[PDB]
A paper describes a structure:
Among the >600 human ubiquitin ligases, UBR4 plays a particularly important PQC role, being an essential and conserved E3/E4 ligase found across eukaryotes. Aside from teaming up with various ubiquitin ligases, UBR4 activity is linked to two specific cofactors: calcium-binding protein calmodulin (CALM1) and KCMF1 (13, 16, 17, 20, 21). Our data show that the evolutionarily conserved UBR4 complex forms a megadalton E4 arena, in which inward-facing ZZ-DZB domains of KCMF1 act not as E3 ligases but as substrate receptors. The architecture of the E4 megacomplex is conserved across eukaryotes, but species-specific adaptations allow UBR4 to perform its precisely tuned quality-control function in diverse cellular environments.
Focused cryo-EM classification and refinement yielded density maps that resolved all folded regions of the human UBR4 complex (HsUBR42/KCMF12/CALM12), except the flexible C-terminal extension bearing the catalytic hemi-RING E3 module. While analyzing our cryo-EM data, we noted additional low-resolution density inside the central cavity of the UBR4 complex. In the resulting map, the ZZ-DZB domains were absent as was the connected extra density. Although the ZZ-DZB motif of KCMF1 is central for recognition, efficient capture likely depends on multivalent, low affinity interactions, supplied by accessory UBR4 domains such as the BP, UBR and BS2 that also line the inner cavity.
Numbering used by the authors: 1808 to 1859, 1865 to 1872, 1881 to 1904, 1909 to 1913, 1917 to 1931, 1939 to 1942, 1945 to 1986, 1988 to 1997, ...
The structure:
């Protein structure tokens, strides 16, 4: 006891030295001292060596390269070591390998074919990822992938020799390449470098850059003349204002130091690891200097040529130069007071080295130096020792001290009370002094046990321990503070650890002591200030850091522990809180995420899990909310933590207390004012604004509030809602959020039209989207704002409807109009789904939903069609469609009209009541529609008729193939109101008789039927009069007019009227019948066909003089013919195939059948081009711009096997050109495509046309063509008229072969010629009238006559009278009509009084076919009933 203490009192004298010096305690002072001694104390060069597979393992304008390298100007270092991985590494291909086997007769990834002349390869120092492969005037930047396999972007040097390039220190994104006169620095982040410098004189020998006292860039070059020059690269010297002349030259006055510095310099290198720089000349002298951090004044200086020292990372003080002349690499290791230089057939070309881990997990440096024979050499701590590097078998001293602790423990536990108590005071003092300084952990344990025993109350042990230790730490820190000396890293760590431990143990006593006054708790604020300064002191780039690890080490852990301490001290004493808030806030807004994120996680863990804690929560909510205005410039990405914290405290928000409800009120009010729902200059929201980003974050916060659902118990009461949710609803409704949202959406309409480790940033911006767009989770401003401005009002409505008390919100019809406008503008799935839910909830009933969207669709489509036609001049006056130029529109206008109209047709197709309703809304749909169909091309007629027929006839009848009946009846009366009689006649004529199609005629019949069957009574009379009037000319439109006959008959037998009218009609019909009969009877061609019909199978009356065009154009059906079986010529190029088909065909569809597709190479998109322009040369029309008319842009999925491209209106084509538009392959000569094979077909029938007309060249060409065709037809005419003689001969007494052989084929030839001739005449007239109107347009007093639509149809581009077929067909139709109209008994009497029985029995008795004759007999029997 007394003797133990007696020896120990002396022992502590050096025991304190051992304990403080032990461990990392004492490392900081030793390191700083050694650094000072290195930079300050003199050293001497010492020659020594103790510091430190076969050849042929290696492979392989070089003359001028030899020249420059001989000039010693440049050299070769072909090596690199990419590791932070295990990557390490003439023919323009160098192999980059791994050396793992050597790492843990050699056993030694990928290779890269270098496309540039290579003298070296340099990895970026901050990041071994990118490597620059370096030559003189060509170099590359390669991002080798994870396995080392080759992307490469080849750097454009624009050489007018580039010495070398360096990626800026710690700047993995920056790099500069310097040549012999100028240096250009570019950032890979942003061709155009961001810096450029040049020299007023001499060459650029060596160029380096470093940091300032703050750390800013400075560029210093040892020139060719040796003049060392310095500059500060900023906005002035940057390449933005141009390459800058170098200005200042640093001074060195040594004994050795005339425009040529001792015969030139050698190099330049300013190590940041040593915090120094070296200097050397082509004289061959070496020296070392350290200079001021801002004055750059060389503070401390010390004294074959030299080149290219290299420091191994994680290997302090080790440098590897190479003698310029001797070629000899030399190693320099510098402790403070000496500079050991060591030198290590196989003429070493280069070397490499890395401080790696050997088989013993020991960081030993391995150096593989490469020779001239391909051989290798293996080569291999002053600052690297643990006592210099920041962090009982040991000390027999610690062993004896442990023995002493055992002795003291025994001398207490078995020692008497008297001795124990008498020695108590001194022993406790000694033990306190012992535990005071840092020492062994086992010493701490033994002392703690002994001292807790010594304290009779272990609570007293803890109390006295807290008081003493805290006082000691506080005094130490306060000395360091008033002193202003920088806090040692481990010092702050140890203090924070100790205080955190004591606070976690006994926070109340901690508050009492750290609060007792030996403002409030200045230790806390001073400690935080210390933390801020020290973190500001962090080594910026850890690579470029000085030999020590400056700044915090386990930074986030220190932050979390400090937060624990601060929160505890705040909790224990309430009156400090107003401070702590701001303190924490300055941290919860710090720049680097390492502070803010760690603090947010810390606090969330901190306040998490009586009334005391809730009160602390409320007070914090008030305090931070006041500082909420400070985030005005925070930046959204640098602001999510605050809101995460607000919600985090809001986790247990029970507003039930009047105070608690008041708290909710303050929160909601502050947030709402922060958003500012009443700005009214909302157009500023369009751009991405910092306050805008913060605002959006706040909105997402309020949304996580409203969407918060405090799901209750099993009870079905509708009032178990989150009080936070109810409040958010109430406040947003009070703030008029609807109008703000709507003004935002309208304001965004402009942009919408114009557009055509990861931090756990949950829950504001989700983790997945973080993974997907880690660039900036506040970057997608427009889309996120749109999503929010939608998804808020829906939830607002959810609460609003759900609340019994609150009357519902009211948004005006602008809501429907604007949201529907949003829907039609395209958007991705999220926007679409949200908008749909919004409209559906808003408009209540799904019927109303679909109806409203439909009406919008129709309104847009009609507006679009009207504007399209107006772009061609067509103008509706009030209800009078008028046109000025009557030309036919090109394909562009037609595809335009067809797209919109067909869309409308599909819409009306889904259901009819919608089309009926939309039409009932606007009275400007019908007459415009019919007027448009009257002028539009024929191929567009079927669609327009389908729509109009759906409108008036309706769904019941059309599908068959009261409310809707009323709609149809009213709309029929409407059409009656708007229609003009002349237009009605023009419609009947154009679409019932003249049309060539069958479906067109059928639909015409349906529309006429339904319109007539329901028009007004007197309207019915008007229609009957008009139709029976037009029937007088039925001879001309002739054989195609069956529909009109049927319609006239139905109208006749259904409608009763005055006998004068009926008599008039009967007179008309009888006269027509008689005249047609007579025209039949005197026919010169009557005899021959008359005889021949009863002899051979008479198919067609092939004995007409001027071919009846109506009889001469049957309806050839579209045949599904393969694109193979029509070809005439084919060819291919790199990516296209040109085929010249047999002849002009009207293609409506085409199908690509794909065989044996290649997974490596697929074609996604294809562009098809048609051309119907005259060409006999395959090469001539391969010009894509001239001879390609695009058809349909078709892109499919990869692997798609059957494609069906159908032109909306069929295209008339001759030469087709198919190109594989987009990919996901055609050979030059034969076009073999090893990807696959393709086949094609088309549902087409031939089309008889010519070349389109373009120029007077076409005028002469076509005139000649038509003339020649006329010659051919003339030969046909003479020869064919010749058959009449021999035909008469065979008639006099074979004939099958005679005419059925000849006459048929003859008529075939003449028909081909005639059809071609007519089409050609049409084309010539088209060009004539088009040039006429165009040249007439220039005349200004000549206002081009706006021709009516009827004038237009007659203006724009009939069976021949003496056609025995025409007369016969007229007879058949007339017989049908007569056998019909006789049915009225009064009509029986009237027709009998006509006495036509004579005419029929006499003229048409045996005429007509079998069926014709039989019907005739039936009629004759009937007429005398």
């Amino acid at each position: 006891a007394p003797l133990v203490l007696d020896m120990l009192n002396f022992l502590m004298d050096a025991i304190q030295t051992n304990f403080q010096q032990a461990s990392a305690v004492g490392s900081s002072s030793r390191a700083q001292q050694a650094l000072s001694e290195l930079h300050t104390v003199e050293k001497a060069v010492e020659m020594t060596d103790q510091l430190m597979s076969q050849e042929g393992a290696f492979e392989n304008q070089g003359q001028t390269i030899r020249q420059l390298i001989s000039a010693h100007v440049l050299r070769r270092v072909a090596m690199c070591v990419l590791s932070s991985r295990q990557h390490l590494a003439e023919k323009g291909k160098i192999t980059v390998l791994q050396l793992s086997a050597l790492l843990k007769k050699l056993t030694l990834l990928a290779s890269a074919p270098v496309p540039f002349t290579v003298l070296s390869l340099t990895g970026n120092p901050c990041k071994e990822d990118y490597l620059a492969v370096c030559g003189l005037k060509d170099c590359h930047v390669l991002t080798f992938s994870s396995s080392g396999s080759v992307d490469h972007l080849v750097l454009h040097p624009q050489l007018a020799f580039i010495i070398k390039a360096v990626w800026l220190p710690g700047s993995q994104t920056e790099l500069a390449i310097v040549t012999a006169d100028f240096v250009k620095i570019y950032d890979l982040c942003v061709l155009s470098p961001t810096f450029y410098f040049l020299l007023p004189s001499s060459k650029i020998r060596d160029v380096t850059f470093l940091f300032n006292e703050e750390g800013k860039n400075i560029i210093v070059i040892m020139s060719s003349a040796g003049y060392i020059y310095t500059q500060l690269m900023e906005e002035a010297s940057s390449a933005q204002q141009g390459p800058f002349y170098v200005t200042n030259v640093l001074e060195i006055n040594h004994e050795d130091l005339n425009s040529q510095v001792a015969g030139g310099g050698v190099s330049v290198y300013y190590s940041h690891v040593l915090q120094m720089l070296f200097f050397s000349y082509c004289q061959g002298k070496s020296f070392a200097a350290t200079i001021s951090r801002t004055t750059l004044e060389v503070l401390q200086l010390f004294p074959p040529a030299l080149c290219q020292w290299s420091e191994v990372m994680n290997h302090p003080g080790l440098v590897c130069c190479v003698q310029q002349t001797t070629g000899v690499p030399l190693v320099v290791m510098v402790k403070p007071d000496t500079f050991l230089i060591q030198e290590i057939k196989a003429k070493i070309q280069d070397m490499v080295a890395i401080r790696h881990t050997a088989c013993n997990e020991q960081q030993r440096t391995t150096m593989i130096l490469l020779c001239e024979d391909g051989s290798l050499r293996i080569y291999m701590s002053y600052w690297l020792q643990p006592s210099l590097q920041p962090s009982t078998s040991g000390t027999v001293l610690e062993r004896l001290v442990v023995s002493s602790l055992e002795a003291l423990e025994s001398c207490f536990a078995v020692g008497p009370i008297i001795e124990k108590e008498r020695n108590k005071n001194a022993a406790q003092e000694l033990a306190t002094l012992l535990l005071s300084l840092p020492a062994p952990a086992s010493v701490q344990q033994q002392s703690k046990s002994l001292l807790a025993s010594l304290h009779t109350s272990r609570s007293a042990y803890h109390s006295h321990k807290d008081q003493a230790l805290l006082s000691k730490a506080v005094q130490c820190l306060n000395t360091s503070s008033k002193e202003g000396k920088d806090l040692d890293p481990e010092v702050f760590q140890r203090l924070v650890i100790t205080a955190r431990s004591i606070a976690i143990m006994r926070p109340n006593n901690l508050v009492h002591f750290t609060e007792s006054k030996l403002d409030c708790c200045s230790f806390i604020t001073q400690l935080v200030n210390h933390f801020w300064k020290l973190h500001a002191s962090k080594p910026k780039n850890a690579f470029l850091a000085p030999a020590c690890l400056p700044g915090l080490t386990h930074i986030e852990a220190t932050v979390n522990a400090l937060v624990d301490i601060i929160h505890g001290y705040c909790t224990c004493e309430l009156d400090c809180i107003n401070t702590a808030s701001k303190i924490y806030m300055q941290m919860l807004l710090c720049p680097d995420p390492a502070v803010s994120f760690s603090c947010k996680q810390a606090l969330i863990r901190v306040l998490r899990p009586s009334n005391r804690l809730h009160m602390v929560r409320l007070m914090l909510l008030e305090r931070l909310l006041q500082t909420l205005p400070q985030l005005r410039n925070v930046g959204g990405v640098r602001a999510i933590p605050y809101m995460q914290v607000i919600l985090m405290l809001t986790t247990d928000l029970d507003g039930e207390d009047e105070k608690d409800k008041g708290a909710l009120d303050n929160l909601l009010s502050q947030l709402i004012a922060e958003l500012g729902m009443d700005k009214k200059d909302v157009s500023k929201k369009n751009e991405r604004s910092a306050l805008n980003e913060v605002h959006l974050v706040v909105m997402r916060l309020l949304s996580v509030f409203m969407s918060r659902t405090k799901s209750g118990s099993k009870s079905s009461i509708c009032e178990s809602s989150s009080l936070i949710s109810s409040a958010t609803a109430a406040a947003l409704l009070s703030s008029g959020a609807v109008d703000y949202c709507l003004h935002v959406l309208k304001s965004l309409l402009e942009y919408w039209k114009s557009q055509q480790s990861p931090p756990d940033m949950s829950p504001f911006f989700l983790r997945q989207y973080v993974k997907g767009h880690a660039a900036d989770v506040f970057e997608a401003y427009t889309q996120l704002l749109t999503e929010m401005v939608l998804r808020l009002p829906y939830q607002i409505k959810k609460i609003t409807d759900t609340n019994s008390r609150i009357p519902p919100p009211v948004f005006d019809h602008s809501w429907f109009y604007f949201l529907s406008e949003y829907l039609m503008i395209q958007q991705t799935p999220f926007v679409r789904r949200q908008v749909r839910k919004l409209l559906l909830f808003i408009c209540g009933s799904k019927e109303k939903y679909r109806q409203l969207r439909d009406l919008h669709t129709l309104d847009s489509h009609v507006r679009g069609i009207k504007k399209l036609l107006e772009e061609q001049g067509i103008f509706l006056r009030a209800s009078v469609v008028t046109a000025s130029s009557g030309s036919a529109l090109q394909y562009d206008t037609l595809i335009s009209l067809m797209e919109h109209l067909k869309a409308c047709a599909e819409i009306a197709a889904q259901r009819t009541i919608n089309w009926q309703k939309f039409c009932i809304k606007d009275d400007s749909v019908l007459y415009f529609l019919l007027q448009v169909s009257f002028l539009v091309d024929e191929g567009v007629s079927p669609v327009l008729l389908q729509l109009l027929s759906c409108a008036l006839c309706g769904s019941k009848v059309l599908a068959a193939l009261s409310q809707e009946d009323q709609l149809c009846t009213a709309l029929v009366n409407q059409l009656n109101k708007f229609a003009d009689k002349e237009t009605l006649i023009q419609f009947l004529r154009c679409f019932l008789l003249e049309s060539n199609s069958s479906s067109v005629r059928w639909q015409a019949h349906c529309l006429t039927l339904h319109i007539y069957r329901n028009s007004s009574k007197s309207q019915q009379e008007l229609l009957l009069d008009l139709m029976w009037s037009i029937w007088p000319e039925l001879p001309a439109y002739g054989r195609k007019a069956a529909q009109f006959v049927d319609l006239l008959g139905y109208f006749s037998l259904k409608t009763p009227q005055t006998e004068k009218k009926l008599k008039e009609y009967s007179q008309k019909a009888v006269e027509i019948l008689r005249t047609q009969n007579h025209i039949l009877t005197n026919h010169p061609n009557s005899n021959i066909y008359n005889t021949l019909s009863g002899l051979v199978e008479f198919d067609g009356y092939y004995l007409e003089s001027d071919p009846c065009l109506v009889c001469n154009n049957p309806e050839v059906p579209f045949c599904y013919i393969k694109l193979s079986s029509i070809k005439v010529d084919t060819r291919y190029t790199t990516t296209q195939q040109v085929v010249k088909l047999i002849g002009s065909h009207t293609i409506s569809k085409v199908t690509v059948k794909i065989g044996d597709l290649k997974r490596t190479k697929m074609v996604r998109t294809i562009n098809l081009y048609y051309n119907n322009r005259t060409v006999q040369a395959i090469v001539e029309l391969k010009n894509k711009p001239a001879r390609w008319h695009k058809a349909k842009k078709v892109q499919l999925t990869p692997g798609q096997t059957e494609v069906k491209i159908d032109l909306p209106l069929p295209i008339v084509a001759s030469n087709l050109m198919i190109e594989f538009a987009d990919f996901y392959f055609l050979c030059n000569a034969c076009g073999f495509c090893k990807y696959a094979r393709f086949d094609f077909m088309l549902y087409a029938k031939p089309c008889c046309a010519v070349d389109p007309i373009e120029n007077e060249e076409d005028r002469k060409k076509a005139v000649s063509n038509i003339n020649t065709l006329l010659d051919k037809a003339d030969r046909v005419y003479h020869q064919l008229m010749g058959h009449r003689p021999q035909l008469e001969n065979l008639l006099c007494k074979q004939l099958a072969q005679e005419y059925c052989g000849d006459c048929k084929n003859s008529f075939d030839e003449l028909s081909k010629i005639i059809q071609k001739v007519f089409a050609s005449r049409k084309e010539l007239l088209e060009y004539d009238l088009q040039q006429r109107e165009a040249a007439t347009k220039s005349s200004r007093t000549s206002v081009q006559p706006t021709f009516t639509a009827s004038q237009y149809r007659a203006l724009s581009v009939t069976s021949s009278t003496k056609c025995y077929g025409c007369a016969s067909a007229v007879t058949e139709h007339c017989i049908t009509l007569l056998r019909a109209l006789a049915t009225n008994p009064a009509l029986r009497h009237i027709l009998v009084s006509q006495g036509l029985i004579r005419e029929l029995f006499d003229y048409n008795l045996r005429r007509g076919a079998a069926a014709m004759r039989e019907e005739v007999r039936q009629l004759m029997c009937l007429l005398t009933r």
